[PDB]
Design a protein around this ligand. Structure first.
Ligand code: Y1C
Ligand code: CL
Ligand code: NA
Lengths: 301, 306
């Protein structure tokens, strides 16, 4: 029993973190096989921030302009290329600690673990979710660029996020490991702003199912709802639309608990209307939206 | 910017987790140098657990009754003995992945990372506090016994917790790595209950400082207070007493933010007496008490553990 925001064990990623230095700029790189991946803005100078021409900046660099340090050891860079917003440095050593891995681009609502790193050394691990507005609510200080987000399903590490920047509201933006940004953001210091964020409805419902599995029923009610009436209500609270995909995804949790998905939607509608009236659900006084249906089944059962 | 509940990187501990089987019971062990540590209740049938005589039960086991697997390699157990509530299995090979480590016993209010494991395989990591009532609010399913809690200082892993049991309220009880229980619990299937818990005041204050550092300031006010006045309020709200050592420990955060501790206590007093009035602090509608002052400084300073 219990229910915690749980990260994946970080060891397989720890063995891949390196330091990348270019000029006066140092950030983190991810070393897999004989390639080190890092944000391409490592090659920017203080004059390049607003409108960098990365192709022009990169053609001026030699392999030996990139200093890559793995623990106490310099790696030799023997080649470089840019893919979208990530730099791929070929090095003359395959990482002996390379796990089974893949690169996966995730959708809003998906969760993943973040290994926060500074100067190529891991600092901490925490759990995040891709918000509907394509930002993440992380904990990142200067020097954290190049820290990565990942899942570990069955000893295979799926890398899904690399950290590039902090937006003025204090939330964070980055790319997949093919260097494509999540959301409308760009690696320039021109004014950009996240969209208004919304609550991840399918995740709140999953977490309510978690509460029932762990023995709490106080928030249920005798009512049901149509899917369309639910969405009409929930969007007035800045909740994401719930789709038939989401209803299908919640099938397993509905079968385990005996509570139909649209009945749980009626409970959520009432909670939005009433608040919690001094009670808690799984130890929270707010509705939690950073647990996916998959997360709940893996942690509970 | 940002503030998250954050665990230490778990890699150094993952390389120490093994699977320990005795009879029909499989659980987790911690493999350090040439010894595997695990809960002594691994040797009990469900009959035994009602009223175990552990010395008696262990007499009948040979080394070969202890099946230990490190990944896909079996380890050869060559000796066995108990220390308090932990079983120590001497094996024929030192763990080549043994980190620099120490066994430490933590105080209530202190935090640590838990590496939750099943069948010797790490499955998740999360951050816990030792509660005033000596339980932890963990997340554990059957098979998680022997999972461990730890902190990292430099390159040194300080092991402080080994999981033994779940209490009826769904919270968790365990030992230090020398087998001494945290709290008034015994490793036996008998009636046991968590005592009434209290809130860790110094940690709430730490978290309010974290909030201010992150720009969440609506709860600040013009007032200050005294230790004696505040502690009367804390007692009334089932908060732990604030001592002078607590105030000293928060000294750095007081100097950095410009909010004296008793200045911040006046904020906390008003929050206790009046609630949050529909507002949140660092995204929470509850007052969070599982970040220590050290946690807040570290996360707001980027300390690392390569
Ligand atoms: C010093 C910083 O703020 C980080 C460097 N950086 N360059 C770009 Br272009 C971006 Br986005 N971030
Ligand atoms: Cl996805
Ligand atoms: Na004040």
């Amino acid at each position: 029993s219990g229910f915690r925001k749980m990260a994946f064990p970080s060891g397989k990623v720890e063995g891949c973190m390196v330091q990348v230095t270019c000029g006066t700029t140092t950030l983190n790189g991810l070393w897999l096989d004989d390639v080190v991946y890092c944000p391409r803005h490592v090659i920017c100078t203080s004059e390049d921030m607003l409108n960098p021409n990365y192709e022009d900046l990169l053609i001026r660099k030699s392999n030996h302009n990139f200093l890559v340090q793995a623990g106490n050891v310099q790696l030799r860079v023997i080649g470089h290329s840019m893919q979208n917003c990530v730099l791929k440095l070929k090095v003359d050593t395959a990482n002996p600690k390379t796990p089974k891995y893949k690169f996966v681009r995730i959708q809003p609502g998906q969760t993943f673990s973040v290994l926060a790193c500074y100067n190529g050394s891991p600092s901490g691990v925490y759990q995040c979710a891709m918000r509907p507005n394509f930002t993440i609510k992380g904990s990142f200080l200067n020097g954290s660029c190049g820290s990565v987000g990942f899942n570990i399903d069955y000893d295979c590490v799926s890398f899904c996020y690399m950290h590039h920047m902090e937006l003025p509201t204090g939330v964070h933006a980055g790319t997949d490991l093919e260097g494509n940004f999540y959301g409308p953001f760009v690696d320039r210091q021109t004014a950009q702003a996240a969209g208004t964020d919304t609550t991840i409805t399918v995740n709140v419902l999953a977490w309510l199912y978690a509460a029932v599995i762990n023995g709490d029923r106080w928030f249920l009610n005798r009512f049901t709802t149509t899917l369309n009436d639910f969405n009409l209500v929930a969007m007035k609270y800045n909740y994401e639309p719930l789709t038939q995909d989401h209803v299908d995804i919640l099938g397993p949790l509905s079968a385990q608990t005996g509570i139909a998905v649209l009945d749980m939607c009626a409970s959520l509608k009432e909670l939005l209307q009433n608040g919690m009236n001094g009670r808690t659900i799984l130890g929270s006084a707010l509705l939690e939206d950073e647990f996916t249906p998959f997360d709940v089944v893996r942690q509970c059962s």
